[PDB]
Design a binder for this molecule. Structure first.
Ligand SMILES: O=C(Nc1ccc2c(c1)CCNCC2)c1ccc(Br)cc1
Ligand SMILES: O=C(Nc1ccc2c(c1)CCNCC2)c1ccc(Br)cc1
Lengths: 326, 314
């Protein structure tokens, strides 16, 4: 099977999780390292209008590297297919966690929300806005840690020139000039509300009635919400993006800090410079090449088999497993 | 979410099995019967005529080897299609995990494909996208044809020469021939890196014959893979072909075992106890086939009865 020749040199294929529209996900094992991955297989003759979104997502994931962002390891392409080798996320969607139970307690919400804030503060530090923050776009890994996905609508608000209406900021609906970041803080406000309430702050049977409600910015505060939760919600759900809470004040907000008593740690634990010597040395022995050639090659970050082997070795080291290539 | 309120009266949602663009497929449980279903969730704002084509065809087609439509729900933002549960995966996935299938195992599978397609054609439809990704295994390892978004220019590698040339039943036979080759070989008879080079190969109609293919398989492949649709084997001669009948000695049974007219009394009686009516009020309601919650409940109860479980609503 043609479209699979190159992929099978590097990965041993396990079960198909399934197929939705143009995209199939298959579990696989990276041969050199033994690590489990998810492979997103996209058919080019089915993808159509979504091809530019696929390219936008790939460009963003090449440049973003964080403990709460689903990691891209490898991009492969044939006549008919684009393959994205991605971080293994068996825990399902935050959406599934919400619908499976009545509303989350303030405490359960904070555990999850502090991870969302970490990811988004990092995205913004890199000059990006995600623009499609919603619970279907947050996955749990096997350590029950959240991983942001679906960067197909993302942009660089200060660089070279969105999704579910219920999560969209007023200024984003009305198509305004902005610093862009502020719209993601509104979407995080919506997520905070839905997590603690089990329903949206703005919802309706028609798109025109929903738009009007978002523009109005009036929402109910249920009796089970604490005063602390109400105060944070008012600061995030400001219709005026200039009056809305900054990422800086969100990171050490009293609600965020409750029970933890330290601010959100958003800085990435996974660098682009600052290579891991153990991994570089082990790659050098496998490829029978000198360390410095190896460093120069890794630093190109081509998202080829080398990028994948380096990143999965680094993942294998973080587990506690030996830093060894088979 | 308002988009999910009506659906969740009838179904308990389980995990996502796939997401691509506007389309997401989620596993679910039908609450009244306890039966598992697949739910295709389509965002209307994120292609609409293809969706309506599939729904129209599936409302009219009912067969043991066609993935069953149970229920269509629509909100402001969503179209939901409740479909037969197929946890055995794509025939495609199955083939590549085995490299290729024996002639024996190919026949078991191919006879089910011929059954589905002969029925589609009997109803005045051509499927036009027959490929191994469009054939799913159910929980009992029986094949179910999906993706009726094209009807009566799918994957070029499965497209008939006369179809590519723009000049409906004969073209599906060519596609089943491609499918027959891939099942026994594990690779395509016509393949290339560009669309123009693939088209040229299909037009010339020359392909390699691997050494492991029997003379019987080679002969059936030549009859299906005729570039001239007038020379190509008919559905009639396919149904009782010597290769088709080898381990079996009876022709392919293509007629549907899944009726629109005949209603099952046990299911009607059980639905009457849930609905608080007599028979005939219930029969008249079922016979409308609206693809509402009643069609789902009837069809799932009938399936619950086919598997040997009690004919009972929770
Ligand atoms: O890893 C993923 N999915 C997945 C992985 C493992 C399992 C599942 C999904 C199904 C649930 N049971 C456990 C096995 C996955 C990862 C990234 C993306 Br994007 C989409 C899906
Ligand atoms: O049920 C379906 N697929 C499915 C369900 C579960 C699993 C799969 C597919 C993938 C194979 N591994 C097991 C998990 C299904 C049914 C109809 C349609 Br259309 C699309 C998908």
């Amino acid at each position: 099977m043609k479209d699979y020749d190159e992929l099978l040199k590097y990965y041993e294929l396990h079960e198909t999780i399934g197929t939705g529209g143009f995209a199939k996900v298959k579990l696989a094992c990276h041969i050199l390292t033994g690590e489990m991955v998810a492979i997103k297989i996209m058919d080019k003759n089915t993808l159509g209008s979504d091809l530019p979104r696929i390219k936008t997502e790939i460009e963003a994931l090449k440049n973003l590297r964080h403990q709460h962002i689903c990691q891209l390891y490898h991009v492969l392409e044939t006549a008919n297919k684009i393959f994205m080798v991605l971080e293994y996320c068996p825990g399902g969607e935050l959406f599934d966690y919400i619908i499976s139970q009545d509303r989350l307690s303030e405490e359960e919400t904070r555990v999850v929300f502090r991870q969302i804030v970490s990811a988004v503060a990092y995205v913004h530090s890199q000059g990006y806005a995600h623009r499609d923050l919603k619970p279907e776009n947050l996955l749990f890994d096997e350590y029950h840690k959240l991983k942001l996905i679906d960067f197909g609508l993302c942009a660089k608000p200060k660089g070279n020139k969105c999704g579910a209406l219920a999560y969209a900021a007023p200024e984003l609906i009305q198509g305004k000039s902005y610093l862009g970041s502020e719209a993601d803080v509104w979407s995080m406000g919506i997520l905070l509300y839905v997590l603690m309430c089990g329903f949206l702050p703005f919802d309706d049977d028609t798109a025109a009635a929903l738009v009007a409600k978002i523009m109005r910015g009036k929402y109910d505060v249920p009796k089970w919400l604490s005063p602390s939760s109400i105060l944070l919600l008012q600061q995030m759900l400001q219709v005026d993006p200039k009056k809305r809470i900054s990422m800086k004040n969100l990171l050490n907000h009293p609600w965020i800090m409750q029970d933890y008593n330290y601010p959100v740690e958003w800085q990435s634990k996974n660098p682009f410079i600052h290579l891991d010597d153990d991994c570089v040395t082990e790659l050098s022995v496998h490829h029978r090449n000198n360390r410095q050639t190896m460093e120069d090659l890794i630093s190109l970050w081509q998202y080829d088999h080398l990028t994948a082997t380096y990143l999965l070795l680094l993942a294998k080291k973080a587990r506690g497993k030996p830093v060894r290539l088979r």
